[PDB]
Design a protein around this ligand. Structure first.
Ligand SMILES: *Cc1c(COP(=O)(O)O)cnc(C)c1O
Ligand SMILES: *Cc1c(COP(=O)(O)O)cnc(C)c1O
Lengths: 386, 387
């Protein structure tokens, strides 16, 4: 029914992902987090229906779009809230910057769990806030929080804001309810505001269940907000819409005020349309996708185990992204990436972008047809040094 | 012609700002917010269909083709030559204004506007905790003019750091002469002011009036000035969300781009990119046609008001599709003027007082609609005006 077998040709679309391939046709990309899968058919139709409006002027977020978000959140994540708790933002990374600027002052400390999505550290640093990197443990193939050190990091730096990634990118760690509750209790104790980046929430796999942060405790809304989107779930990043759910009146007003100060309050018409459409029609597409992602991940894990046993592979609990550790090889980061790029002809995300814990790591995107994922894994193991 | 300026597409199901009230009260005729009730040029519609047919709607970048289109537009239309590297895309011009305020001034510092002017000018200054300096425009012989003596006083007395210029000026539709802009630039050089020229209406000058892009006035002006513009007002594509800054000075360009990234306001949607390139590539004949329709609508309005409401003082635009109306000769308050227009005449105009104190007892009228709609709106405006 849905096509997860053939990858639409993207070379002519000015994509980030395929940019290098436009000049060097032998490069295969598997880095930036979008998919080489056709998007659900109803979004395509919604774009055609937009063209047929004939006039492309100024629009606002409808009651139907607000209801679609409420309905998705309740039905998928058991998170019940009011339409007025929703704030639309053209992207989640924009929302992170707005939250930093609203909820902290210059020089105050913002904590992250490293290694993590590079715009977290970037946005803190560029905003002239103190970055506190709470280093994740790695135990038995999974990231885990050191709660003793996390508390030390909060107290020793007077942390004002915690940027949480859940599911955590990279690694694809789907935090248990009990882990989130311990995090929230630290924030309550130490008077920390928390932003939960839950953009990957719909992509938990292998029986792992997303727990949205404010569902953990009814008091968590007093200090925490949730960011999510339809874009990673449904491969519609180019449509530019996302949302913050901010139930606390003071937090909500502060975020919205800062958004307006920055004139960052407006969203494109297709931004609105694609999100409403994706949530209304996307459940069966997403079910079918998850089966394909699980198969690609299982394939990659087994292939790597057989062809490059020295390569340490973190199996995701969610997301379509695999965190690869080349630390057992006699390499530098520069030699690793020259090797992958110039010899293997594959483009992966550089692990050192995610923090010092990502040195000698790469991140591999498996959201593409299995035939492409097979080729990418073959390239990755081809030229690894003895 | 080949192009439809005769029939207004039905926008009631599109969640537009402009027609929102009419969806509940179908008697209401809107003529306020600046988008048009004309079909967009066909090549844009086709390009949206072509985007759907990409099939995957992932992350995209601004192409060399888009960069070249913007360069070619500026050169061809406005005699403004610069490098592809001088272009900065921003999802809107109002976004760019806030980025510029944050980049080029610090909290507490003074930003100057010519009042009355586009309300987001004053809003963006105030909400950013900068000092607003409102240099009040003169009105002489039916046109806004700058009082240069007072403009200099306002800069000096307030240590003005940044001047937000509107050119063409909204409201009123004043298409500033090269010589006016020369004098403004000289003041900025003298007093060390950075100038942001909002030229979003630049393609919509009319009746022989020609837009003069700020940095074309003198080759040194880009040392302190930058230009904001867009395809969106010109081509009625505001919902596609793209615009640009032209920033030739390396320091100013880096400062703007840095603030933009600090704010994570550096990304633009795929249709943002596509619709702008398309409009600039194919839009010239459509714009020639639009401008004839706009001139005929404005001429109609001026003449109709002269006959039916000679007490109504009408500023004839030199550009833009917006007319500034002065009801000052009527025995009215602002609140009573707008209840009269909205509740009794069933027409929605922009409230003049939104633009500054100088706009008290004024309203702004949007005539970018088919002539028949414009005729009705004008009829309603004069229907209910008090003795
Ligand atoms: C991809 C990603 C984002 C991207 O957000 P935009 O909405 O495209 O700005 C945000 N957070 C994480 C953790 C991501 O992986
Ligand atoms: C309409 C208008 C804008 C609107 O800009 P966006 O690009 O839609 O943010 C900006 N400046 C002036 C003077 C306008 O009239």
């Amino acid at each position: 029914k849905y096509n997860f077998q053939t990858a639409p040709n993207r070379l002519s679309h000015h994509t980030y992902k395929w940019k290098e391939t436009e000049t060097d046709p032998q490069l295969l990309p598997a880095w930036i987090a979008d998919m080489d899968f056709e998007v659900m058919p109803e979004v395509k139709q919604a774009i055609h229906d937009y063209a047929e409006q004939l006039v492309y002027g100024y629009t606002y977020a409808s009651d139907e779009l607000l209801q679609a978000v409420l309905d998705w959140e309740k039905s998928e994540h058991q998170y019940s809230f009011d339409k007025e708790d929703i704030v639309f933002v053209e992207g989640v990374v924009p929302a992170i910057s707005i939250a930093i600027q609203a909820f902290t002052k210059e020089g105050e400390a913002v904590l992250i769990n490293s290694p993590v999505y590079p715009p977290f550290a970037r946005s803190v640093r560029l905003n002239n806030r103190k970055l506190v990197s709470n280093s994740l443990k790695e135990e038995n193939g999974l990231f885990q929080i050191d709660f003793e050190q996390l508390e030390n990091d909060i107290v020793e730096n007077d942390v004002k804001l915690y940027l949480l990634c859940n599911p955590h990118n990279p690694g694809g760690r789907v935090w248990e309810r009990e882990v989130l509750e311990q995090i929230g209790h630290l924030c309550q104790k130490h008077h920390v505001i928390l932003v939960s980046d839950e953009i990957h929430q719909d992509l938990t796999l292998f029986g792992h269940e997303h727990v949205s942060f404010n569902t953990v405790s009814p008091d968590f809304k007093d200090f925490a907000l949730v960011l999510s989107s339809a874009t990673k779930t449904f491969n519609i990043a180019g449509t530019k819409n996302s949302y913050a759910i901010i139930e606390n009146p003071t937090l909500c007003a502060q975020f919205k005020h800062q958004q307006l100060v920055n004139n960052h309050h407006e969203v494109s018409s297709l931004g609105y349309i694609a999100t409403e459409t994706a949530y209304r029609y996307g459940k069966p597409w997403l079910v079918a996708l998850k089966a394909v992602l699980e198969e690609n991940i299982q394939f990659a894990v087994e292939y790597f185990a057989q062809e490059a046993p020295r390569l340490k592979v973190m199996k995701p609990q969610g997301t379509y992204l695999i965190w690869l550790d080349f630390s057992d090889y006699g390499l530098t980061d520069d030699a690793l990436f020259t090797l992958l790029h110039d010899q293997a002809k594959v483009i992966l995300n550089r692990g050192s972008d995610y923090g010092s814990e990502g040195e000698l790591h790469a991140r591999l995107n498996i959201a593409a047809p299995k035939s492409l994922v097979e080729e990418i894994c073959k390239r990755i193991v081809c030229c690894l040094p003895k």
